[PDB]
Amino acid sequence: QGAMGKILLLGPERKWLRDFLESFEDEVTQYQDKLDKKSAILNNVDFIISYGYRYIIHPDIVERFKQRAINLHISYLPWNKGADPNLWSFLEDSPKGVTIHYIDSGLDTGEIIVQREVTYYENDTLRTTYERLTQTIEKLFMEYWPLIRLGKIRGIPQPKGGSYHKLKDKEKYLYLLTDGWDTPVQKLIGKAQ
Numbered sequence: 001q002g003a004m005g006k007i008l009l010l011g012p013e014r015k016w017l018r019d020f021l022e023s024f025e026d027e028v029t030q031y032q033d034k035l036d037k038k039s040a041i042l043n044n045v046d047f048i049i050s051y052g053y054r055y056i057i058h059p060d061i062v063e064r065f066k067q068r069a070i071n072l073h074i075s076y077l078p079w080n081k082g083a084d085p086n087l088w089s090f091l092e093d094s095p096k097g098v099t100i101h102y103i104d105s106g107l108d109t110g111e112i113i114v115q116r117e118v119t120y121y122e123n124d125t126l127r128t129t130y131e132r133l134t135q136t137i138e139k140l141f142m143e144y145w146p147l148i149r150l151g152k153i154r155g156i157p158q159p160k161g162g163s164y165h166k167l168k169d170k171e172k173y174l175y176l177l178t179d180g181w182d183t184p185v186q187k188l189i190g191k192a193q
């Protein structure tokens with residue numbers, strides 16, 4: 001390792017993250033749409049970072065980039081795989097936090113690289129807890145990227161257990177979110193048992 005590389009960032013454009021990665025002398029490209037395994041976007045790519053990427057990455061891409069593709073997920077895996085992890089962490093009163101993991105063929109099931117718990121406070125809202133998770137996982141990424149960049153954390157099998165949600169699962173609970181993002185979380189804790 002140590003050779004200048006090419007990093008593909010999947011998800012929304014984040015100039016701060018592009019700049020951070022380029023300060024290590026790597027070249028960066030960004031993409032937010034679906035990827036066929038033949039896409040030229042993948043040519044000559046050394047490492048993939050997905051952060052808010054909206055699509056399932058095809059298994060042939062996963063295999064081609066074994067141990068070279070990571071995802072930033074704002075849950076404490078194995079809890080709250082999938083959608084709306086912050087909300088579900090309150091509805092199901094689960095552990096809360098953020099996780100950097102290797103991408104495998106399933107959704108948010110790959111090997112864990114590092115995680116961090118994130119606590120909440122009596123008067124937090126979904127907005128304030130979401131923002132804290134976002135800041136925490138961006139911090140955790142930058143804290144550990146100098147090591148990850150050089151293959152120094154091989155990851156561990158994702159513990160068996162936890163939970164998984166699809167985007168539609170929250171519909172029967174939306175009536176609790178009377179103030180949208182500014183709903184106090186206290187109103188939500190345990191409401192899905």
Ligand SMILES: Nc1nc2c(c(=O)[nH]1)N[C@H](CN(C=O)c1ccc(C(=O)N[C@@H](CCC(=O)O)C(=O)O)cc1)CN2
Nearest residue numbers: 053054055056057071083104105106107108109166167
């Ligand atoms: N193979 C793979 N692709 C990955 C991830 C992963 O761990 N493995 N992490 C991210 C997972 N992700 C976002 O970061 C993401 C994007 C879209 C959907 C999706 O398509 N959801 C629908 C149906 C899903 C299903 O049927 O299983 C839904 O919620 O209803 C799910 C998760 C991005 N792509």
